[PDB]
Short mmCIF file of all heavy atoms in Angstrom, two decimals:
data_model
loop_
_atom_site.label_atom_id
_atom_site.label_comp_id
_atom_site.label_asym_id
_atom_site.label_seq_id
_atom_site.Cartn_x
_atom_site.Cartn_y
_atom_site.Cartn_z
N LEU A 2 0.60 2.17 -0.93
CA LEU A 2 1.33 3.42 -1.01
C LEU A 2 0.71 4.45 -0.08
O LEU A 2 -0.51 4.50 0.08
CB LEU A 2 1.30 3.99 -2.43
CG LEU A 2 2.30 3.40 -3.43
CD1 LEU A 2 1.92 2.00 -3.86
CD2 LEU A 2 2.41 4.30 -4.63
N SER A 3 1.56 5.28 0.51
CA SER A 3 1.08 6.40 1.29
C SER A 3 0.55 7.49 0.35
O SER A 3 0.81 7.49 -0.86
CB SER A 3 2.21 7.00 2.11
OG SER A 3 3.17 7.58 1.24
N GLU A 4 -0.20 8.43 0.92
CA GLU A 4 -0.67 9.57 0.14
C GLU A 4 0.51 10.33 -0.46
O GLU A 4 0.47 10.77 -1.61
CB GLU A 4 -1.52 10.47 1.03
CG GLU A 4 -1.87 11.81 0.41
CD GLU A 4 -2.49 11.69 -0.97
OE1 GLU A 4 -3.29 10.77 -1.21
OE2 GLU A 4 -2.15 12.54 -1.82
N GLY A 5 1.59 10.49 0.31
CA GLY A 5 2.77 11.17 -0.22
C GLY A 5 3.37 10.44 -1.41
O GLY A 5 3.79 11.07 -2.39
N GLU A 6 3.41 9.11 -1.34
CA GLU A 6 3.92 8.33 -2.47
C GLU A 6 3.03 8.48 -3.70
O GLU A 6 3.53 8.69 -4.81
CB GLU A 6 4.09 6.88 -2.04
CG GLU A 6 5.30 6.66 -1.13
CD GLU A 6 5.30 5.32 -0.42
OE1 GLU A 6 4.24 4.69 -0.26
OE2 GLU A 6 6.40 4.89 -0.01
N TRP A 7 1.71 8.41 -3.52
CA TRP A 7 0.82 8.63 -4.65
C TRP A 7 1.02 10.00 -5.26
O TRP A 7 0.96 10.16 -6.48
CB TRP A 7 -0.66 8.44 -4.27
CG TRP A 7 -1.07 6.99 -4.14
CD1 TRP A 7 -1.55 6.38 -3.01
CD2 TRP A 7 -1.05 5.98 -5.16
NE1 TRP A 7 -1.82 5.06 -3.27
CE2 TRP A 7 -1.51 4.79 -4.58
CE3 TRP A 7 -0.67 5.96 -6.52
CZ2 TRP A 7 -1.60 3.60 -5.28
CZ3 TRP A 7 -0.77 4.77 -7.22
CH2 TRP A 7 -1.23 3.61 -6.60
N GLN A 8 1.24 11.03 -4.42
CA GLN A 8 1.44 12.37 -4.97
C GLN A 8 2.66 12.41 -5.89
O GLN A 8 2.62 13.04 -6.96
CB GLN A 8 1.61 13.37 -3.83
CG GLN A 8 0.34 13.71 -3.09
CD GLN A 8 0.55 14.77 -2.02
OE1 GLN A 8 1.48 15.58 -2.11
NE2 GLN A 8 -0.32 14.78 -1.01
N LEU A 9 3.75 11.76 -5.48
CA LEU A 9 4.95 11.71 -6.32
C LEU A 9 4.67 11.00 -7.64
O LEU A 9 5.14 11.43 -8.70
CB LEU A 9 6.08 10.99 -5.58
CG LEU A 9 6.63 11.72 -4.35
CD1 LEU A 9 7.53 10.80 -3.55
CD2 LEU A 9 7.37 12.99 -4.77
N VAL A 10 3.91 9.90 -7.59
CA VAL A 10 3.57 9.14 -8.79
C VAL A 10 2.75 10.00 -9.74
O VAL A 10 3.03 10.07 -10.95
CB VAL A 10 2.79 7.87 -8.39
CG1 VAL A 10 2.13 7.20 -9.60
CG2 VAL A 10 3.70 6.91 -7.65
N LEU A 11 1.71 10.64 -9.22
CA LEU A 11 0.80 11.36 -10.10
C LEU A 11 1.37 12.70 -10.55
O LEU A 11 0.97 13.20 -11.60
CB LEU A 11 -0.57 11.53 -9.44
CG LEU A 11 -1.24 10.19 -9.15
CD1 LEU A 11 -2.58 10.41 -8.44
CD2 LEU A 11 -1.44 9.43 -10.46
N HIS A 12 2.34 13.24 -9.80
CA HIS A 12 2.99 14.46 -10.24
C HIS A 12 3.81 14.22 -11.50
O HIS A 12 3.73 14.99 -12.47
CB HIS A 12 3.85 15.00 -9.11
CG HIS A 12 4.50 16.29 -9.45
ND1 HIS A 12 3.80 17.47 -9.54
CD2 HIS A 12 5.79 16.59 -9.74
CE1 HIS A 12 4.63 18.45 -9.88
NE2 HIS A 12 5.84 17.94 -10.01
N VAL A 13 4.62 13.15 -11.52
CA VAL A 13 5.35 12.83 -12.73
C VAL A 13 4.41 12.35 -13.83
O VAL A 13 4.61 12.67 -15.01
CB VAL A 13 6.53 11.87 -12.47
CG1 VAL A 13 6.08 10.47 -12.12
CG2 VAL A 13 7.47 11.85 -13.69
N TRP A 14 3.35 11.62 -13.48
CA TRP A 14 2.44 11.16 -14.51
C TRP A 14 1.76 12.31 -15.24
O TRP A 14 1.52 12.23 -16.45
CB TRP A 14 1.40 10.17 -13.99
CG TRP A 14 0.89 9.35 -15.13
CD1 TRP A 14 -0.27 9.54 -15.83
CD2 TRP A 14 1.59 8.29 -15.78
NE1 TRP A 14 -0.35 8.62 -16.85
CE2 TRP A 14 0.78 7.84 -16.84
CE3 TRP A 14 2.81 7.65 -15.54
CZ2 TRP A 14 1.17 6.78 -17.67
CZ3 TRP A 14 3.19 6.61 -16.37
CH2 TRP A 14 2.36 6.18 -17.41
N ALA A 15 1.48 13.41 -14.54
CA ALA A 15 0.90 14.57 -15.22
C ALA A 15 1.86 15.15 -16.25
O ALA A 15 1.41 15.74 -17.25
CB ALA A 15 0.46 15.62 -14.20
N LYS A 16 3.17 15.00 -16.04
CA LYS A 16 4.14 15.39 -17.06
C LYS A 16 4.08 14.45 -18.26
O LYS A 16 4.18 14.89 -19.42
CB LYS A 16 5.56 15.42 -16.50
CG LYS A 16 5.73 16.14 -15.17
CD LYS A 16 5.71 17.63 -15.35
CE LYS A 16 6.03 18.36 -14.05
NZ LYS A 16 5.87 19.83 -14.24
N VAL A 17 3.91 13.15 -18.02
CA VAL A 17 3.78 12.18 -19.10
C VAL A 17 2.60 12.54 -19.99
O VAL A 17 2.68 12.46 -21.22
CB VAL A 17 3.63 10.76 -18.51
CG1 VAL A 17 3.30 9.73 -19.60
CG2 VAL A 17 4.88 10.35 -17.75
N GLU A 18 1.49 12.95 -19.38
CA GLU A 18 0.28 13.17 -20.15
C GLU A 18 0.34 14.42 -21.01
O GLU A 18 -0.56 14.64 -21.83
CB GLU A 18 -0.93 13.15 -19.22
CG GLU A 18 -1.19 11.75 -18.71
CD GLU A 18 -2.46 11.63 -17.91
OE1 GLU A 18 -2.88 12.65 -17.34
OE2 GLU A 18 -3.02 10.52 -17.87
N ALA A 19 1.41 15.21 -20.90
CA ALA A 19 1.63 16.30 -21.84
C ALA A 19 2.11 15.81 -23.20
O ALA A 19 2.04 16.55 -24.19
CB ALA A 19 2.64 17.30 -21.26
N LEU A 69 -0.47 3.64 -22.42
CA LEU A 69 -0.26 4.63 -21.38
C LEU A 69 -1.57 5.25 -20.91
O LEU A 69 -1.68 5.65 -19.75
CB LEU A 69 0.73 5.69 -21.83
CG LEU A 69 2.16 5.22 -22.10
CD1 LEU A 69 3.09 6.42 -22.31
CD2 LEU A 69 2.70 4.34 -20.98
N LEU A 72 -2.85 2.74 -18.45
CA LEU A 72 -2.05 2.77 -17.23
C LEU A 72 -2.32 4.02 -16.41
O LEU A 72 -2.41 3.94 -15.18
CB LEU A 72 -0.57 2.61 -17.57
CG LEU A 72 0.35 2.58 -16.36
CD1 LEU A 72 0.02 1.43 -15.43
CD2 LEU A 72 1.80 2.46 -16.85
N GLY A 73 -2.46 5.17 -17.06
CA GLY A 73 -2.77 6.39 -16.32
C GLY A 73 -4.09 6.31 -15.59
O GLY A 73 -4.21 6.76 -14.44
N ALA A 74 -5.10 5.71 -16.22
CA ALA A 74 -6.38 5.53 -15.55
C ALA A 74 -6.24 4.63 -14.33
O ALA A 74 -6.86 4.88 -13.29
CB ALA A 74 -7.43 4.97 -16.53
N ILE A 75 -5.38 3.61 -14.40
CA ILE A 75 -5.12 2.76 -13.24
C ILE A 75 -4.44 3.56 -12.13
O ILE A 75 -4.86 3.53 -10.96
CB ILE A 75 -4.29 1.53 -13.66
CG1 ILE A 75 -5.14 0.54 -14.47
CG2 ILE A 75 -3.65 0.85 -12.47
CD1 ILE A 75 -4.29 -0.42 -15.29
N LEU A 76 -3.38 4.29 -12.47
CA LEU A 76 -2.62 5.00 -11.44
C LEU A 76 -3.47 6.03 -10.72
O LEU A 76 -3.33 6.22 -9.51
CB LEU A 76 -1.39 5.66 -12.06
CG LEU A 76 -0.34 4.70 -12.61
CD1 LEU A 76 0.74 5.52 -13.31
CD2 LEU A 76 0.27 3.81 -11.53
N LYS A 77 -4.37 6.70 -11.44
CA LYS A 77 -5.19 7.73 -10.84
C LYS A 77 -6.21 7.17 -9.87
O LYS A 77 -6.77 7.94 -9.09
CB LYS A 77 -5.85 8.58 -11.92
CG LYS A 77 -4.84 9.43 -12.68
CD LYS A 77 -5.46 10.13 -13.86
CE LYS A 77 -4.38 10.62 -14.80
NZ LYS A 77 -4.99 11.30 -15.97
N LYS A 78 -6.47 5.86 -9.90
CA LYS A 78 -7.31 5.24 -8.88
C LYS A 78 -6.58 5.03 -7.57
O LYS A 78 -7.23 4.63 -6.59
CB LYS A 78 -7.80 3.86 -9.33
CG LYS A 78 -8.57 3.84 -10.63
CD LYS A 78 -9.84 4.65 -10.51
N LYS A 79 -5.27 5.24 -7.51
CA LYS A 79 -4.51 5.14 -6.27
C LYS A 79 -4.78 3.82 -5.56
O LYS A 79 -5.03 3.76 -4.35
CB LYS A 79 -4.75 6.36 -5.37
CG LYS A 79 -4.35 7.67 -6.06
CD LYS A 79 -4.91 8.94 -5.40
CE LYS A 79 -4.41 9.13 -4.00
NZ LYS A 79 -5.04 10.34 -3.37
N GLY A 80 -4.73 2.73 -6.33
CA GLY A 80 -4.89 1.40 -5.79
C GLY A 80 -6.29 0.84 -5.88
O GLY A 80 -6.46 -0.39 -5.78
N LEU A 115 10.83 7.73 -17.79
CA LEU A 115 10.46 8.84 -16.92
C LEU A 115 11.69 9.51 -16.33
O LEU A 115 11.72 10.74 -16.17
CB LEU A 115 9.50 8.39 -15.83
CG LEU A 115 8.02 8.38 -16.23
CD1 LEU A 115 7.72 7.75 -17.61
CD2 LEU A 115 7.21 7.74 -15.11
N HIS A 119 12.08 13.38 -17.27
CA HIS A 119 11.59 14.24 -16.18
C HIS A 119 12.48 14.17 -14.96
O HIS A 119 11.99 13.94 -13.85
CB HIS A 119 10.17 13.85 -15.79
CG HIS A 119 9.26 13.72 -16.96
ND1 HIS A 119 8.89 14.79 -17.75
CD2 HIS A 119 8.70 12.63 -17.54
CE1 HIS A 119 8.11 14.37 -18.73
NE2 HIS A 119 7.98 13.06 -18.62
N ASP A 122 11.53 15.88 -11.65
CA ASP A 122 10.34 15.36 -11.00
C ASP A 122 10.41 13.86 -10.82
O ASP A 122 9.39 13.20 -10.56
CB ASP A 122 9.08 15.77 -11.77
CG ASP A 122 8.88 17.27 -11.74
OD1 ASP A 122 8.59 17.79 -10.65
OD2 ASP A 122 9.05 17.93 -12.79
N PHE A 123 11.60 13.29 -10.97
CA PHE A 123 11.77 11.86 -10.89
C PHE A 123 13.10 11.53 -10.21
O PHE A 123 13.87 10.70 -10.68
CB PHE A 123 11.63 11.19 -12.26
CG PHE A 123 11.10 9.79 -12.19
CD1 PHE A 123 9.85 9.52 -11.64
CD2 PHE A 123 11.85 8.73 -12.66
CE1 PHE A 123 9.35 8.21 -11.57
CE2 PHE A 123 11.36 7.42 -12.59
CZ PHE A 123 10.10 7.17 -12.04
N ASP A 126 13.12 9.59 -4.60
CA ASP A 126 11.84 9.46 -3.91
C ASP A 126 10.72 9.07 -4.88
O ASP A 126 9.97 8.12 -4.63
CB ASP A 126 11.52 10.74 -3.11
CG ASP A 126 11.41 12.01 -3.97
OD1 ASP A 126 11.80 12.05 -5.16
OD2 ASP A 126 10.93 13.04 -3.42
N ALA A 127 10.61 9.77 -6.00
CA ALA A 127 9.58 9.47 -6.98
C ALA A 127 9.84 8.17 -7.71
O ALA A 127 8.89 7.45 -8.05
CB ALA A 127 9.46 10.64 -7.97
N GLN A 128 11.12 7.83 -7.96
CA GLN A 128 11.44 6.53 -8.54
C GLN A 128 10.96 5.40 -7.66
O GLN A 128 10.36 4.43 -8.13
CB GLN A 128 12.95 6.41 -8.71
CG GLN A 128 13.56 7.28 -9.76
CD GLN A 128 15.08 7.33 -9.62
OE1 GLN A 128 15.72 6.30 -9.35
NE2 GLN A 128 15.66 8.54 -9.76
N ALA A 130 8.58 5.54 -5.41
CA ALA A 130 7.12 5.53 -5.34
C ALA A 130 6.52 4.93 -6.61
O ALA A 130 5.57 4.14 -6.54
CB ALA A 130 6.61 6.95 -5.11
N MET A 131 7.08 5.28 -7.77
CA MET A 131 6.58 4.71 -9.03
C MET A 131 6.84 3.21 -9.08
O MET A 131 5.98 2.43 -9.52
CB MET A 131 7.25 5.41 -10.21
CG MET A 131 6.73 4.93 -11.58
SD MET A 131 4.94 5.15 -11.86
CE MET A 131 4.94 6.92 -12.15
N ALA A 134 4.11 1.68 -7.07
CA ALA A 134 2.82 1.69 -7.76
C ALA A 134 2.76 0.63 -8.84
O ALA A 134 1.72 -0.02 -9.01
CB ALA A 134 2.57 3.07 -8.37
#
Side-chain angles (χ1 to χ4, degrees), residues 2-19 69 72-77 79-80 115 119 122-123 126-128 130-131 134:
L2 279 73
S3 67
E4 170 52 39
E6 286 166 338
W7 283 119
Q8 286 183 25
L9 293 169
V10 167
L11 298 177
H12 183 72
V13 70
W14 202 261
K16 313 283 186 186
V17 172
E18 290 187 334
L69 295 189
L72 182 60
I75 288 160
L76 294 174
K77 291 173 197 179
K79 301 164 63 183
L115 274 46
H119 311 293
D122 294 292
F123 210 61
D126 61 347
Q128 290 166 41
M131 183 59 75

